[PDB]
Symmetry: C6
Subunit: 202 residues, 6 copies
């Protein structure tokens, strides 16, 4: 049970990458998924059951929660990490099929090119998605949470004060994820610069 | 432990497919199942416990919820994704048995045809199911949710106002799924056009 | 790691079956288990917590629920699908042991029969169980659910109105399962007719 | 990856068994564990939360529940199925070690007996445990449940009426398990009779 | 895929053990983990939600529960079973590394001792931990539970009566675990006596 | 299926380590993860639902809980154990790639150094993280919990007394984790001293 075809595929996929990029970028993905699945996912469990508002009006809590949180952070991060990893899978499948076709051609008729361009495009799109998600998060929420929220949506009469759950831990986790995203963006830009320098000097 | 029979089966199954269809259509299924299982399934958890109506009448909440939501979106999508994937499994089993029979025939007696038609039929049925589900969803619900619902079902007296849970996130997820379905439909139609052009020109 | 003994066992088990029966009957089992485990099992979760009755008498809700639902549909279906699949497992084990004994005999002493009857018996019993379960379900419940139930069991005084949870989705799922069961019954009867015709003409 | 040592161990373990016992007794274990893990385990979930008594005295519900149910049925059945399966595992380990020692002896010094007795003892103990558990269950509970219970334990004043959850489904499952246990006992006694007849006639 | 190195490691690890100890001690661990994970873990679920005290003072329930149960039984048993199994893992790793080093030495330079002492030390420490845990449990709790508890901790005024959940089942499980622990201790002492007798007579 | 490349990688990774460090440090990680995942994670489940304060003011409980527990202990420990294990994974990947490159070089052109420095750096960083986390925990919380907390945050009027859940078990687990961390730190420092002594004397 020798896993040599996996080695061939891995070597072909990582032909144009640097030595460092083969390590940090791979470990960061594992770090990200572990942190997302273990710690943060449980702090957001009681985000609506422990949300309280000061009023007797039936229906103000629902509308005020929907106004405060149009989309939860955890699902935003899940979307972010899904959109960032699909280009690599597409490239891997492309390489797999190309290798199979080349092997068939070699066995049948013996009885720098497109791949670099695809690699560059994938690396560009990953950074584009990172920047877009960061900008959207900055515009909608920010990078902090306050304990008291003021609601002025009907049928609440003239105003309402509402109180959040765990507004301090979530800030810490938000900052952690921001740092991780910035590190990933920098590591992805370095690869583009290296590739273009190699392609220009020679 | 060489997995060569899997390669033979894969090559036989994807004989008439294009180069692109071998990649995007496969990755889209993984994207779909991951998104369905991770993010959306948790937003619909408190769909009946956090549903509130303004009245003292016992029994109005149950009937009004049943009137508003005859069937949840998540289970509708589960049915949609199950009905779209069975034709491929049937075709795969058919090819498996045909290959086994051909091998037996070759070993025993040496001591464009039906498969294309089945492929075309499967591709047609997948698109048919996609369109049918989209039309049903458009007729029953639409592609948005409102925060306030008006109920006029007995025993509620003369009318009742009821309030939903997370009416903004669900709209976002609905739009995402709509886009995914449209992309899948287009990618399936392209294959039919390509196959018919190849079969007509030659 | 060649899986050839599995192939021998599979060919021996499916010797008397038709070409179609090797595909539809196998896929239907997967469809059934997936649908049972994913969608329906979650709709029946709040079947007793969201069941409400109009009264102040302590104890009427419990007795009225027990009177309305002597046994839940999901567990009835689990029993149905367990009782329908055991004959095949028994036949498979029988074939396995017979093959081992035949191999031992061949190696030791060289230093249409019972199996058809067992196959017929198993196919008969599967249909018998299907019909029995369908008849019991028809007699006890029917194939629909109503939103309001009338209870006349002690200690409830003179009568009580009670209200169910999700009475419309469950009807849809009931109809789905009924259709699946009918399809399975028809596909099983076809095999008996084919076998008897082959055994009579030759 | 040929699994021949597993075959040798299986043949050695089942040397003195009948043809039928190799099939029904093995399938019954799978049936038992599936039924225990899928259906019954969920019906007993709300056994204490939905238990209600008619009184204002704080503490009567706890003591009356503890008096009605000294031990739940599901855990009783788990103990029953654990105590019935350990002798076979002990015998299997004994055979494994004996085979290893015999192989070592054969390679080193070539440079009806105890096993039957152990088999008989294990078969006897399995039936003994079955009978003991059945008798205990008959003495403590019976084979049915009633909807209303009468409690006369302090601090409840002079008497209390309490009401159970799902008293009709549980009776059905109890009867099912009783039938399964009786079938297992009969199948185990048959093996003893067969073994003793073979050992006496020859 | 022959698993011969596993056999070598197993034979080396169990060189000084008796015939019986290779069976009962191994099966007892499986029995213990199964019983701990299946039955008992669910009876302790509602240990604080169903705990009730007779008073209106806010805060007496929390302090009285903390006074009654400084540590739950299930977690005590988890610690007990973890502390008893680590010496064997350490010894196994030691043997693994020693065997690798010996193989390297044999291939390089051909181009009763410490292990017994380690075995004895491990066997001693297992019994020491068993006895220590039993003594601590006897001192803190005992081997039974009563339904009514009397609390005299502030801010409760002058006294309070509190009521437990399932005080009869837990006694049964406690007795079961006590018996298992005693059996394990005896089986471990037998090995020490056998080893010392063999080492003294010869 | 011989796992010899795993052996080569393991021997290369642990070339500069002592004999003891190959055992205790590996077993301690398993001990840590088992203890974290089995016992402690369930004691912190009802940390906010069972937290109670004496007042009628809506919103004081949320703010007072957020003030008492800026971050839960379990998630702090998860972060601690994640930050301590990434350097080893980075070093392992580095060694893997270096070995592959060396093999390629050997096959192509035949048709104490950096690794020690990386090992030292990783060992230093692990201890640095341990010390930093211990200091932060000491500064923020301490190593004990009290049953009564005094809150002076708005909108609570002038003061509030609040009561915690399970304040005695958590102290025990905190002490356990502290001891484990200290042991790990000592075992890591020993390796640095040994390495430097070997590098200086020779
Ligand atoms: C694993 C350690 C094995 C070391 C090893 O030499 O295996 C190589 C395969 O690498 C590989 O194993 C390729 C890596 C793919 C396996 C990883 C996926 C499973 C688990 C991933 C979890 C971590 C994230 C052999 O290959 P070779 O020497 O023959 O060189 C190809 C020349 N044609
Ligand atoms: C995996 C990477 C292995 C690369 C490789 O060359 O394996 C081929 C098999 O492909 C295959 O492995 C076929 C793909 C089936 C495996 C995928 C299913 C398991 C996981 C799926 C999750 C992703 C969705 C060898 O085949 P060959 O060179 O001998 O060519 C057949 C000529 N007769
Ligand atoms: C799998 C695809 C492998 C294709 C293949 O040729 O494998 C055959 C075995 O079939 C088989 O693999 C038998 C099917 C049993 C495997 C399926 C059970 C695992 C997963 C089931 C989930 C789906 C429901 C080889 O057999 P051969 O050419 O040597 O012919 C026996 C002549 N003596
Ligand atoms: C599986 C189907 C394989 C059929 C087969 O011939 O395999 C035999 C092994 O049987 C076996 O495979 C022994 C049965 C043990 C495997 C079952 C345990 C895993 C799953 C259990 C779930 C069901 C309960 C070969 O053996 P052979 O022809 O070489 O005869 C031993 C002569 N020395
Ligand atoms: C399994 C049944 C296989 C029987 C068998 O003969 O396998 C032996 C290996 O034993 C073994 O398999 C060693 C036992 C380790 C496997 C058990 C761990 C996995 C599951 C554990 C769950 C139960 C607790 C062969 O070994 P050999 O004849 O070559 O003798 C070593 C001479 N150098
Ligand atoms: C396992 C017991 C097998 C014993 C054995 O000799 O296997 C060695 C491999 O070690 C190994 O197996 C390396 C250890 C990696 C496997 C452990 C990862 C899976 C489970 C981990 C859970 C415990 C934490 C053979 O190697 P060799 O004699 O050929 O020497 C390399 C010379 N070039
Ligand atoms: C549900 C299962 C069947 C499919 C889901 C898993 C895949 C989507 C995984 C398998 C390997 C993963 C990759 C492993 C590591 C990397 C690190 C990083 O890529 C790199 O830069 C690697 C270094 C390099 O090649 O230069 C970005 C994420 C990525 C591609 C991962 C993206 C997600 C991948 C493709
Ligand atoms: C529970 C387990 C035992 C069975 C359930 C899994 C199957 C139903 C999976 C295995 C592979 C899956 C397929 C993998 C990828 C594709 C992509 C797509 O098909 C294609 O067009 C592939 C590209 C081509 O062949 O042209 C539509 C879904 C489909 C068939 C998937 C449908 C679901 C399949 C058959
Ligand atoms: C927990 C694990 C170890 C055992 C539980 C799984 C088995 C009970 C499964 C394995 C394969 C399954 C079978 C696979 C497919 C078929 C389709 C169908 O049988 C057929 O008619 C197959 C076609 C034919 O042979 O003619 C009825 C169910 C059955 C026998 C399934 C019944 C359940 C089986 C035996
Ligand atoms: C957690 C894992 C690692 C161990 C737990 C599983 C075992 C305890 C299983 C493996 C195979 C099982 C056995 C498979 C089938 C049989 C049927 C039956 O035994 C027979 O009579 C078999 C027929 C015969 O040999 O005559 C009684 C239960 C028993 C021994 C089972 C008892 C439980 C066993 C030993
Ligand atoms: C019942 C027995 C006879 C067989 C079943 C147990 C084995 C599978 C155990 C015994 C010794 C274990 C090994 C002992 C020590 C280590 C710890 C660990 O060592 C490392 O590689 C540390 C990582 C690093 O090098 O930095 C990796 C797993 C490994 C090889 C263990 C793998 C599993 C082993 C082989
Ligand atoms: C999470 C995974 C990767 C590691 C956790 C599992 C181990 C800690 C297991 C593997 C085998 C187990 C052992 C299997 C059986 C025995 C029986 C018993 O030891 C004996 O006396 C065996 C008989 C003998 O050798 O004399 C005490 C527990 C012990 C060592 C077990 C302790 C726990 C062990 C080492
Ligand atoms: C989700 C899966 C795919 C990846 C997550 C698991 C890894 C991060 C594991 C695999 C082996 C583990 C290691 C096994 C044992 C050790 C013991 C210890 O390292 C040692 O000192 C080993 C002894 C030595 O080499 O001197 C510190 C933790 C470490 C490196 C572990 C850190 C976590 C590791 C790398
Ligand atoms: C958090 C800090 C992570 C640092 C990322 C690595 C920085 C060094 C650059 C890696 C490439 C080395 C050649
Ligand atoms: C979201 C956009 C997805 C685009 C789908 C692919 C469009 C290009 C066509 C694929 C075939 C390339 C030859
Ligand atoms: C839902 C409809 C399912 C149809 C079942 C198959 C009908 C055709 C008969 C199969 C055998 C083809 C020879
Ligand atoms: C439920 C009924 C189960 C019947 C058990 C088998 C009865 C026949 C005896 C089996 C041995 C056949 C030789
Ligand atoms: C519960 C009783 C368990 C008994 C343990 C075995 C007693 C016999 C001694 C085993 C060694 C046999 C030589
Ligand atoms: C808890 C105590 C753990 C002790 C750790 C081991 C102490 C001995 C040093 C190990 C190296 C032996 C050479």
């Amino acid at each position: 049970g020798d896993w040599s075809a996996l080695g061939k595929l891995l070597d072909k996929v990582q032909a144009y990458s640097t030595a460092g990029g083969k390590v940090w970028l791979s470990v960061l993905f594992i770090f990200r998924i572990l942190l997302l699945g273990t710690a943060v996912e449980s702090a957001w469990g009681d985000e609506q059951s422990a949300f309280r508002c000061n009023t007797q009006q039936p229906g103000c809590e629902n509308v005020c929660y929907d106004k405060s949180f149009p989309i939860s952070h955890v699902r935003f991060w899940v979307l972010q990490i899904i959109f960032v990893s699909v280009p690599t899978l597409l490239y891997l499948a492309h390489v797999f099929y190309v290798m199979r076709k080349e092997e068939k051609l070699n066995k049948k008729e013996e009885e720098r090119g497109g791949l670099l361009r695809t690699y560059i495009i994938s690396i560009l799109f990953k950074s584009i998605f990172e920047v877009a998600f960061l900008l959207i998060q900055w515009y909608i929420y920010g990078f902090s949470l306050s304990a008291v929220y003021t609601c002025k949506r009907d049928p609440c009469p003239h105003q309402v004060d509402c109180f959040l759950s765990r507004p301090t831990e979530k800030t810490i986790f938000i900052i952690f994820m921001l740092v991780v995203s910035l590190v990933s963006l920098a590591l992805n830009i370095i690869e583009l610069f290296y590739v273009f320098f190699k392609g220009v000097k020679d």
